[PDB]
Structure 1
């Protein structure tokens, strides 16, 4: 127990994947679908309306015009009048 060997060398095993991944943990490409085609899933933008259930509350950090997750959608009959007293119809 006074002396301990078991040293090996970590200077070659960990370079085997690339030297730039050594200083930065590298990004994560998304999964390509046949329907997605050339378009790749962007984790910085999603310009569409998604169903509320089965989704997770998104967050924004800066600019990035974006769609939403629709919670309620319904069609009714509109009121024939703006307000006040202007109620001309004919």
Structure 2
């Protein structure tokens, strides 16, 4: 609409095919080039031994 973009920032998760990785030089908050993205079902438990499904 009226947003001004520069050549040295990106806050968006851009497509990562044929797109060069990038280069970051100190500080800054950055977007990314998504290498993988997978929505699945998590498996119960974190670590150790004790696991409880429901309480």
RCO higher in 1 or 2 (8 Å CA, sep ≥ 6)?
Answer: 2
TM-score, reference length from structure 1? 0.54
- d(CA) in 1 for partners of 2:47 and 2:21? 37
- d(CA) in 2 for partners of 1:81 and 1:62? 38
Q: Which has the higher helix share?
A: 1
In our comparison, the structure showing a higher alpha carbon Rg is: 1
Retained in 2: the 8 A contact 1:44–1:64?
Answer: no
- Aligned partner of 1:69 in structure 2 is 33
TM-score, reference length from structure 2? 0.81
User: What is the CA distance between 1:75 and its match in structure 2?
Assistant: 1.4
Q: Root-mean-square deviation (CA), in Å? A: 1.3
Q: Which has the higher strand share?
A: 2
Structure 1 pair 54–40 and aligned structure 2 pair: CA distance change class (3 A): farther
- d(CA) in 2 for partners of 1:50 and 1:84? 38
Q: Which runs of 5+ in 2 are unaligned?
A: none
Q: Which runs of 5+ in 1 are unaligned?
A: 1-36
User: What is the CA distance between 1:54 and its match in structure 2?
Assistant: 3.3
